[PDB]
Structure formats: structure tokens, C-alpha cells
Amino acid sequence: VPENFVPGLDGVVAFTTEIAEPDKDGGALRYRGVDIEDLVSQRVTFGDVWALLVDGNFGSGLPPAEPFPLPIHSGDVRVDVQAGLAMLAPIWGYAPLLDIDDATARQQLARASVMALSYVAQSARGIYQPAVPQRIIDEASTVTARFMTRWQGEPDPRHIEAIDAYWVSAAEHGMNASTFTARVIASTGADVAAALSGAIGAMSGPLHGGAPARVLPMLDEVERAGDARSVVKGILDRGEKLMGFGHRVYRAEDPRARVLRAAAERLGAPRYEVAVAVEQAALSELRERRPDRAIETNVEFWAAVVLDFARVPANMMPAMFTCGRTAGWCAHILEQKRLGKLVRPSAIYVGPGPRSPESVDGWERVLT
Amino acid sequence: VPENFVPGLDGVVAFTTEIAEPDKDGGALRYRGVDIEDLVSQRVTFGDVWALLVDGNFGSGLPPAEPFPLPIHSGDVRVDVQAGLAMLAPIWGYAPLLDIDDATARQQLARASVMALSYVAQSARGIYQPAVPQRIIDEASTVTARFMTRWQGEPDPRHIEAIDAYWVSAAEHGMNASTFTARVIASTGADVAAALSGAIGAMSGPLHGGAPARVLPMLDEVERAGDARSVVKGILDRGEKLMGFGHRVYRAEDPRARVLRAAAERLGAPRYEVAVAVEQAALSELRERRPDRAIETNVEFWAAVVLDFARVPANMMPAMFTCGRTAGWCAHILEQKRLGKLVRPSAIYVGPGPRSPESVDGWERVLTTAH
Q: Does residue B337 share a domain with residue B294?
């Protein structure tokens, strides 16, 4: 037993990556050395950012999704895509990562990744309404535009811009619980379909983080009252928790939160005026009751505003975060494939010592 | 900014566990301090050993499976159960692990674990054959007996004992890759359905280990030829590698392999004599060619013989190992829930430095909109 053993691999370095660098001490996020704020400002679509993270160079984009309607209908969009991806291996003949070269692995990843987006659009649209015809979908020119058309039918072009802004900013942010899970499964040599399915499972956790905040009810109280300061004061005074704000992640303002806020004003989001007022009031009050800590806006606050601007429901937002994070997942799965090392930590036994089966409680309730 | 880095968390202590002790130096395996070789010797069914690992005591064994026919037919038995388990949460209303007490999580794990057995039995039986009536299944007593009845229709009692031997010996063997995957997903607060589904995905990997070895073609040849030593010699000479024999896992013979060989002989498996003959020939020839290495019989070798004796096909064997490991997964998922600590390591960036998009190879091929 190591003294002062810290569980959870907290701070332990497991991997070395060339994919992306969250420079928290410098307040910037770079994909293969390219700042995400440059990518969004020059309007690089999510399809190409997927290539940059996975391949390392601008080039072979994310292929158009192929006609394959969703076979899973559970009412939970996370469950539908997680179970749907796992079933792609037998039908598409996905060999284990141990038996394929890097070129095949990438194409399998690109095929399954864009198929995951198609599932989420179908699940969001629901089964109580006919699907969008393929001829209509083919009129779209980008992967993000295809997702909006498959889901909404006649999407607003501004909403398509907002989804690209969100998906690029959420594509890859270092070692997560989900990204770690994807690499652990891939380290076992399993096919890419199972690795992506497991990553979605870890993504569904409340403690994983990065999921858009439940701030829409808060943005309605300010809409009714018309005074952001009083609503923020009330929640704190009444003993409730203020949502979308907390301790800083970067050294300062999160770059993703900055670009998402800039995306809201640039696209004329109706909630933008209220959202800024809530943000100013929430920070003035929170920094006043504890002026010694550093308190900055959570990226999840502006993620909720931008997704809501694109008609994304509250129960669909976690799927949207999963859709963008497929870029980081596939890149890390491919990098883990080249590493060729299995992840196998160790545990230290602190349980009971040797004992006969009869000495254990409840032995008389066992037969044979 | 690295050091003499050893990637892969090799030997790094991540958790402390009270569940089971893989005593590799001592050459024994113990569930909650109870030797597996004592559990099998007294014929404790898989349901009670599931209770021992999760609970810590032999009370409140594994409940009977409820009628719920498999909705997933993909052609891969692993895929059917991995996708089927994940679909259980919306219909059964499983809340996330963060929002339930320990008593509920134990019940949800037991309900889903026995359902995973039901899926594997149904998927193995196949869609080209009417399902076994529930009243026929109800005539069984143990959980293992129900699994064989739901699959085979009229199972042989010896085959049922062969599975209780295998499932107990493969229920828990420490912090393997799949158990680690289950604990990581559970630490995020996700519901037990997703944690079990993720564990099966990591199980499917060829490098996870424990998947029963493909020794059946080799055991077929020795039966035809009758010269076990020659067949072993022939396989090595022409560049192939023998199946089920490699580097040692423990200091010496694996007790899991020992009890499986003992079970194969106790139940009169038709392949036992041919398997012992091959094992003796394999060890003799392998240790002569590499005297400086410790070669031991893999547990996968005798696992394949025992599963084959119980009429388990080759492509069903990886699913059978998944069925047994649900005991260890559920115990570790429950232990992780009480720990209440997210698992998140870190990484060191060694990639390219800051650069503009125009300086990236292939920028000329990115189409961008601009109003």
C-alpha cells in the first residue's frame, strides 16, 4: 500500500499525443498547432476539421453519409447511436484493428463517424414523421448541412453556421474520460466500431463534463423579469445553485467560450442580449461573495445558447456534443492503433485474507 | 517535457480493491479470500459466486431472468449482447449511477447481468428455430441450468457442470482491460447499462486475453493421426505457432488452467486424453527449443476443451467468457460507485507548434464560405 495513494490516475501521464494541445496556461486551444479561433474565423467546416485532427493535414474530407436508416428506437438518442454503431461491424465487415493497416482503419473510422451523425439526425427527427427524401438531402454541400437537412428538412443557413461553430470548438480537448475509454478499447485490438460505442457510453456520464448546461430555464426567468441582476441575486440568496459558471479551466476566459459567444452575436441570436446580461450579472455577484477565487464563464453556458439558437432541444444537446467529439475520438483511436501497446494498470488488494467458504456469512443458504 | 516514459500505464496502481486477489507469485486465485479451487470443488453455482464478488457474502444470489426476447440480430453474438444491454436503460428506466443509492445499483446490476446471459443463449440458439418455452426454462433450478435450457433445449447435466466450472474460474481476475473500461465509464456517473456495454466492447479485442484458444483444429489432427508429438513437431517446423501455449501468467501453472483440466477429466470429456497428450508434447518441445524461457499452458487451452465438451461452438466461445466476467464487472462497477472519484489521466503534447491555416499541407483543398 503506497502512502498517500491518490486514486483515479489523477495527474498520471499515460500518453504522448501529437493531435492537439489545450494551452490552459496560455489560454488557447490548437488543433495540430492551428488555433481553433482561426478555424472558426475563416469558416472551416467540421468535415475538414475532422481530417485535420485525424490525418494531421488538410486534405481528404469526411465522406458523405450513405443511405442506412436507423434500426434502434429506444427514445434516448445517446442509446440509439451507441447501440447502432456497435452493430455496424458485422454488416460492414469491420475486422479488428489488429488485422488491418492504418489506411483501412482511417477509412473505417471516417465511414462510421459520418454514419453516427446520420443516426443522430434520424433519432432527433423521430419515428412519428416520415424521413427526409435522399434527393433533398443531396442538395446540401457540407457534412454539417447534410445533418441539418436530414433532421429539420429545410434548415436555416444561420443555424448551420452555428452548428459548425460549436462542432469545431468541441472536436478535441485532450484526454477525457471518453477519449481515454476509446483508446483503452482500441488498445485491446478491437474494431473501431466497438471503440466508438464504448466512448459514447462514457460520454453519457454526468461527471464527464463539457455537456451543454441546463441554463435555458434560467434564461427564461430573466426574459420574464427583464432584470438579470435580480434573478441572479435570487438564485444565490434562496440557497440555489447558479448554473453555467464556476472556477476557471484555462488561466482566464475559455477560448471556446469566447468563440461561441462571438458566434452568437455574429449570427444575431435572439437570446444573445439576455445571455450577455446574465453573464455580466452572474460574474459580478459570484466574484463579490468570494473575491479571492478566479471565476470565469463555463463554456457550457454559451454552448447551450448556440445550440438552442439552432433549434436543438434540451434532451438533444448531449448528442450534439457527442457528434463533434467524434473527431477527437477517431484521431486518438488511430494514434493508439500505431502505438501498439495495451493499457493494463494494476490494483492492490486490501480485502480479507484467505478463508474457507463456510467461514463466509450466508453459507447455510447455498446448496450443493 | 518527457522522461524515460513507459506508455500504457504498465504497472501503475490505479485503484485499491477488496474484491479478489490474483496471487501470481503464490500460484492461486481467491474471490474475497476464498480460493476458486475450493468453490468449484464444492460445486457452487455461478449465481452464488456472483453474489460473493458483488456483495462480499453468499446471500441474495442472482435472480431469475425475466421474459424479454432478444431484439438485436446482427450475426455476431458479442454485438447482439453489447447493443442489447445498452438498450435496457430507456425501457427499464435506469437512472445514472450518480442519482441512485448503493442498494438500487446492486439490484440494477443483478437484473441486467442475468439478462445478458439470456441474450447470449437466445443469440446462440439462432433465429431459424422456435424459442424454448418459458415453462421448460422454469423447470431448471440454477442460473446456469436456465442458460443451457434456454439455448440447447434439453441440455446434458454434465455439460451444465462444465459451464459452472468455467464460469466460476473466469468470473474475476483483477484489473484487466475490460474491467478497467467498466470502472472508467462508471466513474463518469453513467448508468450501469452503459458501463456493462462498454466493457463487452473492450472484451472483444484479441489482445485482451482470455478468449478461448483456437486449438480445435489441432486437436482434430491428433485424433486422426494418433501421434501427438509429431503433430506438435510439424506445426513448429513449418513456421506456425502452437495455440494455447506461451509466456507464463503466474509463477507456475495457472490454477484456472488446473481446475479446467481437472473438470475436463472429472466429467469424462471425449477430448481429455488427446488434450493431455498434446499438452505434454507441447511443453516438452517448446521448452527444448527455448530452455531460457518459462513456458506454461495457457488457461485458454483448457477453456476451449471444456467449452467444446459442453457443445459450445467456436464463434460462441468469446461470448461465454463475457458471460462469466459479468460477475467481476458488476462487483467492480459497484466498488467504483462508492469510491466516487472520476478516472482521468493526463497526456503530454509533443506535436507541432503554432502555425496558420495557410501554412498547413493541403490548405488549397479546403472550400470556405464568405459573405
A: no
